[PDB]
Amino acid sequence: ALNLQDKQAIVAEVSEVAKGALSAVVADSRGVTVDKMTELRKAGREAGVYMRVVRNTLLRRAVEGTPFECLKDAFVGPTLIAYVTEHPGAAARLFKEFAKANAKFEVKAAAFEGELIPASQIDRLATLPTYEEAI
Amino acid sequence: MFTINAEVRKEQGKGASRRLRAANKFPAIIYGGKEAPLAIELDHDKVMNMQAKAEFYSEVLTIVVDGKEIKVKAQDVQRHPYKPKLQHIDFVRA
Amino acid sequence: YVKLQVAAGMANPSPPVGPALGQQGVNIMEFCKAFNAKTDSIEKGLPIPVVITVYADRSFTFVTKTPPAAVLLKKAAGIKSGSGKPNKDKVGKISRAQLQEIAQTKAADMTGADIEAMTRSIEGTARSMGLVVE
Amino acid sequence: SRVAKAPVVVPAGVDVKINGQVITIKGKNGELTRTLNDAVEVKHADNTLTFGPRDGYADGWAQAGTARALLNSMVIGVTEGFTKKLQLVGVGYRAAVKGNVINLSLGFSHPVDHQLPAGITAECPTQTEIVLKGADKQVIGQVAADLRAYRRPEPYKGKGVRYADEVVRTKEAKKK
Amino acid sequence: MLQPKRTKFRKMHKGRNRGLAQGTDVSFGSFGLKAVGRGRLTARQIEAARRAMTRAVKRQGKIWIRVFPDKPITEKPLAVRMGKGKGNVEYWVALIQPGKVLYEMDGVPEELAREAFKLAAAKLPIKTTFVTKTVM
Amino acid sequence: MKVRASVKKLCRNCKIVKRDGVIRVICSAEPKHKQRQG
RNA sequence: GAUGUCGGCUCAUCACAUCCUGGGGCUGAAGUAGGUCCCAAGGGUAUGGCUGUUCGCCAUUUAAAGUGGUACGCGAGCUGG
RNA sequence: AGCCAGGAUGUUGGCUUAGAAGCAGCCAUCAUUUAAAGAAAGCGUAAUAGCUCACUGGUCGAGUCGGCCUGCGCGGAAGAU
Ligand SMILES: [Mg+2]
Ligand SMILES: [Mg+2]
Ligand SMILES: [Mg+2]
Ligand SMILES: [Mg+2]
Ligand SMILES: [Mg+2]
Ligand SMILES: [Mg+2]
Ligand SMILES: [Mg+2]
Ligand SMILES: [Mg+2]
Ligand SMILES: [Mg+2]
Ligand SMILES: [Zn+2]
């Protein structure tokens, strides 16, 4: 089991990678094999995306430090968080095509700008190109 | 710091010590220095849990006997022959 | 659907793949030559793993995988048969430069992200077969 | 106690009559009645049913737990309804319903005629399936078990009257 | 099977097993098996117990037998009338008073020390408690 | 049915249940594990 | 200042630690047949060869040929090997 | 406690064997992707598969776990009018 010493450390690591990171992607990960997971881990690390499954009781504490403090109501049910540290967007697209291919889960909500994104309008961070497109 | 609350013994000898033990309490002696030895009664439950910690035998402990506080060290424990209980303790005035 | 390990230029004998693959519903002649026609580039004397994806119409589709981790540590150290008692009996020796050789080839199958992550997953396959890192 | 504290929710068009210990629960799917143990005090109020221990009775909470449990399934009974399914395994085994009688072919001299009690009704979708429908959980259980008893699933082939959900672990016969 | 090599006398007067034990503490090992009851331990018993616990610890660690069967026990056979001398010595015992440490064992985890002592305890005529070493 | 003075849980699926004063071991996985104290 | 001994015969009576028949759990129980245990005392439970023998060996039956108590039941009932 | 989900990759670890692919035996028991998954606690397969556990994320919503000293009980517990 997770002791508070181990509990705090988790809160800290997520709270820290929250500050620097640009776009975070909250989603469901129930009823999917490890073979499919370990695969979206290779697609994540490549696209500069940070992947984690953390306790909703710990994620509500680790996001309290702002700007993602509108994802509270997004920590109900299984949760997977995709912090995009290098270039904003990368996960919100990596998920959008992983969802359509595997048919399981829904992807809870997206976060950016310190403003809320509902389950209906996740096509916003999914239609953005590169950085690296303005030249 | 181990704080042991105690009382000076009103009776002494076999009879008294047995009666004491029955009443879930146990006799103990405080000796050392110029000061005459002190016959004390201790609670069997509270001290037994204390002595479970190894530190009980290394550290200096305070034995509260009627307001007064006596700094002593664990000198010699007399244990129950087969039960996990304590029969008597020698406290050397430190 | 079954997992097997057939040679770089050999695919036909009866004792290894014979009544093990032909019992499901796979052609003993259509697979035997289609497998050796694509594994011709793969070096002689190196076992190569292959997985079969069979459907309800006896048809088949295979994607070949890189040689095993307990397979490439025998040709790099100079041993035909391993140690019966691993870490109790030493059969050979392999340098830090030979560990990355086996790792750069296994890059298509390995779970690791870094070279050091793929090197440590070959370090483990070496200790559990008697071989010592020197 | 955790069972007794959890309340039973009486739905709409479900009448609850409580005469001291005697409870009567009427509905669409029928009517059930029960005599609650003296150690149980039941309270009606609102669209709910609550159970608690009666003063002086030691087994109070233990009794209250069972009381709740029962009434909960009575409520389910006279609304939703219980449905037990049984499948006949093995050569020659057949079954058909003749009103309130399940006629059973189970490899005996005589075919078995099993009279059905009140509120339990049977139908045979196949010659190899018996479906029981009713309001009393204790009774629908009783009847299912009685029919199963005619030929308990044998451990060598799985042959006999088995429950739909039943997982009949089979074993190999002695070697030589 | 424990027994005195030589003795000053052949046979011994019956005596009594009154009083409490001496040797009430784990003085060599990390764990001990202490008598709660009062009785006689025969060498064949002591061995049966020793054997079972030695098997348990997979002969790893150390074991000490705190007791020794030094009392000779005599017996009269069938169709032998009373008197006509003291019966012949047949076996040897150890008089056990409550509190005797019987065995001590160390160099094994407490879990294993408790199990090894559980098995040995089974081949014994008197009730036993598991004990651990102490500081005074 | 093993009738003995010492009735014990023989596996994880074994369960000690007291029926009419008779300490019993009832098991869901092993039938050989079925016991009654007597 | 006498409580007649083994075995048989005749006649028994109880216990159950059950031989058969009855109910049942496990089985290294397919069936048939066994093995083991639990319940159970209602009734039933060979005839011969050999030996004073009980016992035992053997022959041939039987669903079975139970184990014990009863002054090693039973001589003011018989026998007397 | 229950209920939903997952319990992966190197890899079928090495040796052995007609086969040993966690699961006849023997020796070792690291490392990777990790929320977590033993180079595997049990059933199964000729060997595979398949089923489930250790472990972990979700749900739930307030208690839960098993040692210590002790009082009184239960089983262990079959006999002959
Ligand atoms: Mg006196
Ligand atoms: Mg009963
Ligand atoms: Mg006279
Ligand atoms: Mg009986
Ligand atoms: Mg037996
Ligand atoms: Mg009879
Ligand atoms: Mg016969
Ligand atoms: Mg007589
Ligand atoms: Mg006469
Ligand atoms: Zn069991």
Tab-separated table of N, CA and C (backbone and C1' of nucleotides) in Angstrom, chain G residues 14-15 17 68, chain H residues 78-81:
chain	number	residue	atom	x	y	z
G	14	C	P	-31.992	-58.491	25.693
G	14	C	O5'	-30.753	-57.548	26.018
G	14	C	C5'	-30.793	-56.637	27.066
G	14	C	C4'	-29.388	-56.313	27.527
G	14	C	C3'	-28.570	-55.527	26.533
G	14	C	O3'	-28.836	-54.129	26.597
G	14	C	C1'	-27.299	-57.338	27.259
G	15	A	P	-28.554	-53.245	25.265
G	15	A	O5'	-26.949	-53.140	25.218
G	15	A	C5'	-26.264	-52.486	26.268
G	15	A	C4'	-24.805	-52.356	25.962
G	15	A	C3'	-24.517	-51.770	24.614
G	15	A	O3'	-24.407	-50.431	24.741
G	15	A	C1'	-23.267	-53.735	24.872
G	17	A	P	-20.511	-47.397	19.327
G	17	A	O5'	-18.936	-47.395	19.033
G	17	A	C5'	-18.126	-48.405	19.568
G	17	A	C4'	-17.317	-49.109	18.485
G	17	A	C3'	-17.912	-50.384	17.920
G	17	A	O3'	-17.406	-50.613	16.587
G	17	A	C1'	-16.027	-50.904	19.271
G	68	G	P	-13.833	-61.399	20.720
G	68	G	O5'	-14.359	-60.351	21.815
G	68	G	C5'	-14.832	-60.763	23.097
G	68	G	C4'	-15.408	-59.564	23.809
G	68	G	C3'	-16.270	-59.872	25.002
G	68	G	O3'	-15.492	-60.065	26.152
G	68	G	C1'	-17.429	-58.438	23.615
H	78	A	P	-19.734	-40.437	23.231
H	78	A	O5'	-19.076	-41.895	22.985
H	78	A	C5'	-18.913	-42.844	24.054
H	78	A	C4'	-19.274	-44.260	23.607
H	78	A	C3'	-19.347	-45.307	24.723
H	78	A	O3'	-20.637	-45.332	25.338
H	78	A	C1'	-18.061	-46.147	22.944
H	79	G	P	-20.772	-45.542	26.928
H	79	G	O5'	-20.743	-47.137	27.131
H	79	G	C5'	-21.719	-47.950	26.468
H	79	G	C4'	-21.717	-49.381	26.970
H	79	G	C3'	-21.746	-49.570	28.476
H	79	G	O3'	-22.941	-50.261	28.799
H	79	G	C1'	-20.315	-51.116	27.427
H	80	A	P	-23.911	-49.740	29.954
H	80	A	O5'	-24.797	-51.038	30.227
H	80	A	C5'	-24.248	-52.146	30.891
H	80	A	C4'	-24.172	-53.343	29.972
H	80	A	C3'	-24.050	-54.669	30.682
H	80	A	O3'	-25.369	-55.126	31.019
H	80	A	C1'	-22.563	-54.535	28.805
H	81	U	P	-25.640	-56.155	32.241
H	81	U	O5'	-27.228	-56.178	32.310
H	81	U	C5'	-28.038	-56.595	31.196
H	81	U	C4'	-29.513	-56.503	31.576
H	81	U	C3'	-30.038	-55.091	31.894
H	81	U	O3'	-31.446	-55.020	31.642
H	81	U	C1'	-30.237	-56.379	33.809
